[PDB]
Amino acid sequence: GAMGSMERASLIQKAKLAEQAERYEDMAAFMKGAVEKGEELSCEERNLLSVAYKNVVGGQRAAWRVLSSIEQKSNKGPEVREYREKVETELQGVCDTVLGLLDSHLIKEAGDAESRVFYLKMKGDYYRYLAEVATGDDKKRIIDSARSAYQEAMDISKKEMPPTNPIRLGLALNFSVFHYEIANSPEEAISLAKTTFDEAMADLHTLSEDSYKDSTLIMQLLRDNLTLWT
């Protein structure tokens, strides 16, 4: 890879610079390079990886939705479809790249609950993004791949993490969105968000001020979704 000649520490440094410069494609390329060094990622480094690719795929998804809507309204020549397909293929490529990093070899080397849950949550999210654009023979298998990753993450998080842990909360938030938006399971979505919120509320008393702030931010996003869905 193109980052093979750069020091791991320099890749991490440049990823942070790229974030400050809002150069998320560069940030992702630097973090891919860092992962490919073969060493486990620290907490901070995992967050850099996540931010980078979330921003890249976020832009692609937003563009895809714009184009897909124009295409739907068209149903003129092949151009709308062609360009939607172009964006779709690029999105799929980014998701496949992230999934590839997780599979080679981030997940298998992740032994601590925090790391393993983080990566399995990512795996669910990127299969979810593939599901958003999927049609044809494999869509069910993509959906099930997302579900399976999220479910393993949920099982570990319930056993190993407090109900206020931000990763646990974020996982629950995203899995509930999977249920609502992908799996046609709004009741499951609502039940997951509600139970997550309530169990977190009950554990807030254990937290410091700074931990309280983070947990309550995510709880408010759960509440916001519950409000939207009910």
């Binding site: 967050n47 931010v51 979330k54 921003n55 939705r65 999210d125 931000p166 974020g170 938030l173 995203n174 969105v177 609502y180 938006e181 983070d214 931010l217 995510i218 996003l221 916001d224 979704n225 939207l228 869905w229």
Partner: peptide, 9 residues
């Protein structure tokens, strides 16, 4: 679509 988790603060 429903909002998923945003970037951390």
């Amino acid at each position: 679509r429903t909002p998923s988790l945003p970037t951390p603060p």
